[PDB]
Enzyme design. Structure first.
Site, PDB file in Angstrom:
ATOM      1  N   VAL A  58     128.815  88.893  72.369  1.00 28.50           N
ATOM      2  CA  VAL A  58     129.331  89.338  71.084  1.00 28.50           C
ATOM      3  C   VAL A  58     129.633  88.158  70.175  1.00 28.50           C
ATOM      4  CG1 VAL A  58     131.602  89.317  72.041  1.00 28.50           C
ATOM      5  CG2 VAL A  58     131.150  90.814  70.103  1.00 28.50           C
ATOM      6  N   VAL A  59     129.506  88.329  68.864  1.00 27.26           N
ATOM      7  CA  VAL A  59     129.743  87.212  67.938  1.00 27.26           C
ATOM      8  C   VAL A  59     130.903  87.619  67.032  1.00 27.26           C
ATOM      9  CG1 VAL A  59     128.901  85.852  65.963  1.00 27.26           C
ATOM     10  CG2 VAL A  59     127.243  86.586  67.677  1.00 27.26           C
ATOM     11  N   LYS A  92     130.471  82.686  69.669  1.00 25.64           N
ATOM     12  CA  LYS A  92     129.718  83.642  70.480  1.00 25.64           C
ATOM     13  C   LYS A  92     130.221  83.603  71.910  1.00 25.64           C
ATOM     14  CE  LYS A  92     125.434  84.652  69.784  1.00 25.64           C
ATOM     15  NZ  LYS A  92     123.949  84.510  69.791  1.00 25.64           N
ATOM     16  N   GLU A 138     128.411  76.916  63.270  1.00 22.10           N
ATOM     17  CA  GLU A 138     128.656  76.943  61.827  1.00 22.10           C
ATOM     18  C   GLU A 138     128.528  78.386  61.376  1.00 22.10           C
ATOM     19  OE1 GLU A 138     124.977  75.090  60.002  1.00 22.10           O
ATOM     20  OE2 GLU A 138     125.875  75.480  58.139  1.00 22.10           O
ATOM     21  N   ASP A 166     122.641  87.347  57.289  1.00 22.73           N
ATOM     22  CA  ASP A 166     121.421  87.161  58.047  1.00 22.73           C
ATOM     23  C   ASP A 166     120.321  87.770  57.169  1.00 22.73           C
ATOM     24  OD1 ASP A 166     120.593  89.966  58.873  1.00 22.73           O
ATOM     25  OD2 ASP A 166     122.277  89.682  60.290  1.00 22.73           O
ATOM     26  N   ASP A 188     112.606  83.149  70.400  1.00 25.02           N
ATOM     27  CA  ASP A 188     113.031  84.483  69.981  1.00 25.02           C
ATOM     28  C   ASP A 188     113.353  84.573  68.503  1.00 25.02           C
ATOM     29  OD1 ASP A 188     113.204  87.033  70.277  1.00 25.02           O
ATOM     30  OD2 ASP A 188     115.337  87.009  71.038  1.00 25.02           O
ATOM     31  N   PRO A 216     114.563  88.285  62.251  1.00 28.42           N
ATOM     32  CA  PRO A 216     115.405  88.216  61.046  1.00 28.42           C
ATOM     33  C   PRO A 216     116.875  87.990  61.314  1.00 28.42           C
ATOM     34  CG  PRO A 216     113.633  89.842  60.737  1.00 28.42           C
ATOM     35  CD  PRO A 216     113.653  89.464  62.219  1.00 28.42           C
ATOM     36  N   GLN A 217     117.475  88.550  62.354  1.00 28.47           N
ATOM     37  CA  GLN A 217     118.867  88.442  62.681  1.00 28.47           C
ATOM     38  C   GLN A 217     119.211  86.989  63.038  1.00 28.47           C
ATOM     39  OE1 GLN A 217     116.329  90.686  63.641  1.00 28.47           O
ATOM     40  NE2 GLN A 217     117.235  91.561  65.435  1.00 28.47           N
ATOM     41  N   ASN A 218     118.240  86.182  63.406  1.00 28.47           N
ATOM     42  CA  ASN A 218     118.373  84.812  63.819  1.00 28.47           C
ATOM     43  C   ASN A 218     118.060  83.866  62.652  1.00 28.47           C
ATOM     44  OD1 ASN A 218     119.317  85.140  66.266  1.00 28.47           O
ATOM     45  ND2 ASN A 218     117.416  84.995  67.451  1.00 28.47           N
TER      46      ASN A 218
HETATM   47  N1  LIG Z   1     126.330  81.374  63.139  1.00 25.84           N
HETATM   48  C1  LIG Z   1     126.445  82.624  62.724  1.00 25.84           C
HETATM   49  N2  LIG Z   1     127.093  82.809  61.553  1.00 25.84           N
HETATM   50  C2  LIG Z   1     127.296  84.064  61.081  1.00 25.84           C
HETATM   51  N3  LIG Z   1     126.868  85.200  61.572  1.00 25.84           N
HETATM   52  C3  LIG Z   1     126.234  85.010  62.736  1.00 25.84           C
HETATM   53  C4  LIG Z   1     125.979  83.795  63.329  1.00 25.84           C
HETATM   54  N4  LIG Z   1     125.332  83.968  64.462  1.00 25.84           N
HETATM   55  C5  LIG Z   1     125.161  85.216  64.583  1.00 25.84           C
HETATM   56  N5  LIG Z   1     125.673  85.955  63.572  1.00 25.84           N
HETATM   57  C6  LIG Z   1     125.234  87.323  63.314  1.00 25.84           C
HETATM   58  O1  LIG Z   1     125.933  88.131  64.209  1.00 25.84           O
HETATM   59  C7  LIG Z   1     125.128  89.188  64.745  1.00 25.84           C
HETATM   60  C8  LIG Z   1     125.058  89.060  66.272  1.00 25.84           C
HETATM   61  O2  LIG Z   1     124.126  87.978  66.461  1.00 25.84           O
HETATM   62  P1  LIG Z   1     123.479  87.748  67.896  1.00 25.84           P
HETATM   63  O3  LIG Z   1     122.972  86.404  67.996  1.00 25.84           O
HETATM   64  O4  LIG Z   1     124.506  88.172  68.921  1.00 25.84           O
HETATM   65  O5  LIG Z   1     122.373  88.938  68.073  1.00 25.84           O
HETATM   66  P2  LIG Z   1     120.910  88.969  67.407  1.00 25.84           P
HETATM   67  O6  LIG Z   1     120.770  87.723  66.623  1.00 25.84           O
HETATM   68  O7  LIG Z   1     120.675  90.227  66.711  1.00 25.84           O
HETATM   69  O8  LIG Z   1     120.127  88.869  68.790  1.00 25.84           O
HETATM   70  P3  LIG Z   1     120.022  87.660  69.799  1.00 25.84           P
HETATM   71  O9  LIG Z   1     121.206  87.805  70.735  1.00 25.84           O
HETATM   72  O10 LIG Z   1     118.842  87.753  70.648  1.00 25.84           O
HETATM   73  O11 LIG Z   1     120.181  86.374  69.072  1.00 25.84           O
HETATM   74  C9  LIG Z   1     123.736  89.024  64.125  1.00 25.84           C
HETATM   75  O12 LIG Z   1     123.665  89.880  62.969  1.00 25.84           O
HETATM   76  C10 LIG Z   1     123.739  87.533  63.639  1.00 25.84           C
HETATM   77  O13 LIG Z   1     123.042  87.548  62.366  1.00 25.84           O
HETATM   78 MG   LIG Z   2     121.111  85.711  67.243  1.00 25.20          MG
END
Ligand SMILES: Nc1ncnc2c1ncn2[C@@H]1O[C@H](COP(=O)(O)OP(=O)(O)OP(=O)(O)O)[C@@H](O)[C@H]1O
Ligand SMILES: [Mg+2]
Length: 290
Positions: free
Chosen positions: A17-18, A33, A73, A78, A119, A122-124
């Site tokens: 979870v983030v 995270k 950071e 996203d 991997d 867009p979410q990354n």
């Molecule tokens: N450094 C960051 N700053 C702000 N928001 C973030 C950051 N990292 C992640 N998030 C956002 O939080 C949400 C959870 O991200 P998370 O990395 O857990 O899952 P994901 O990117 O959808 O999949 P994956 O786990 O494979 O990376 C996503 O929408 C990501 O855009």
């Molecule tokens: Mg991610």
């Protein structure tokens, strides 16, 4: 963790979870995270020195009581959310181009240090108000493993996976991140995912139906890959003029080279930065409402 105040839950993903959090002593607003095996600690620790302005900074690594916390950071949005917000109008081409250019610079930097994302999606891809875009979670898939379901049992997106991975190549290259970015480039321009597969065979067969079933002519060695089957249907290739219509011929030429079937022939990030498509590249600022 006592040094951080959880402000809010941003989301959850593959590994954990983030949270948006505040450093209770530095004052810094960060993304925390919560995800430990030896090889992963070592691997995550080398990511701390891979710094680049188009890579989300890994500020610190907290290993406590069997749990691992990665401090990043924080960026305010996203790319999936930006795409969904710009759906009625589409991201203007000059911003699309600037984003693609910046992500290629990020990729050439990691790739020149032999580090692969594995991997991209867009979410990354995180953006700020200045017009910058950065790659998030670089290096985590290799450090920890890439499960078919998320920690939340949610499904792994196959939409951006390169075909050599789907055909069972064990040792694929930095070409897999170029395939992914190519797929994300097509999705920004058309406002629809290029290959939305909902299973491995579906994903593969969506590729084959747009780009043609690969054979020994376009990809020497393809018929001997592990998950290759002689019974795959034989579909014709389609014209990119039909696949990403609005895009001009420079864009279309660049995208087809980023989608080359043979990973050895796909363009690298460094040659892609020299493509004629980036001749008039600029850095617009997005319409961003936080
Ligand atoms: N450094 C960051 N700053 C702000 N928001 C973030 C950051 N990292 C992640 N998030 C956002 O939080 C949400 C959870 O991200 P998370 O990395 O857990 O899952 P994901 O990117 O959808 O999949 P994956 O786990 O494979 O990376 C996503 O929408 C990501 O855009
Ligand atoms: Mg991610």
């Amino acid at each position: 963790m006592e040094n951080f105040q959880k402000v809010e839950k941003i989301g959850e993903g593959t590994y954990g979870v983030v949270y948006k959090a505040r450093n209770k002593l530095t004052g810094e607003v960060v993304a925390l995270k919560k995800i430990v095996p030896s090889t992963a600690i070592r691997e995550i620790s080398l990511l701390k020195e891979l710094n680049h302005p188009n890579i989300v900074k890994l500020l610190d690594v907290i290993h406590t009581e069997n749990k691992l916390y990665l401090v990043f950071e924080f960026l305010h949005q996203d790319l999936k959310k930006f795409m969904d917000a710009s759906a009625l109008t589409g991201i203007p081409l000059p911003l699309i181009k600037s984003y693609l250019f910046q992500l290629l610079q990020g990729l050439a930097f990691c790739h020149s240090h032999r580090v692969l994302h594995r991997d991209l999606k867009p979410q990354n891809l995180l953006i700020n108000t200045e017009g910058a875009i950065k790659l998030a979670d670089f290096g985590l898939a290799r450090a920890f493993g890439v499960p078919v379901r998320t920690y939340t049992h949610e499904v792994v997106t196959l939409w951006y996976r390169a075909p050599e991975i789907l055909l069972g190549c064990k040792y694929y290259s930095t070409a897999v991140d170029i395939w992914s970015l190519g797929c994300i480039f097509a999705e920004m321009v058309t406002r629809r995912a290029l290959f939305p597969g909902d299973s491995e065979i579906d994903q593969l067969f969506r590729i084959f139906r747009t780009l043609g079933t690969p054979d020994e002519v376009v990809w020497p060695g393809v018929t001997s890959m592990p998950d290759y089957k002689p019974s795959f249907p034989k579909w014709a290739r389609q014209d990119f003029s039909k696949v990403v219509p609005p895009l001009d011929e420079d864009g279309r030429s660049l995208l087809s080279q980023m989608l080359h079937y043979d990973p050895n022939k796909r363009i690298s990030a460094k040659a892609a930065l020299a493509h004629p498509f980036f001749q008039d590249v600029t850095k617009p600022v997005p319409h961003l409402r936080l």
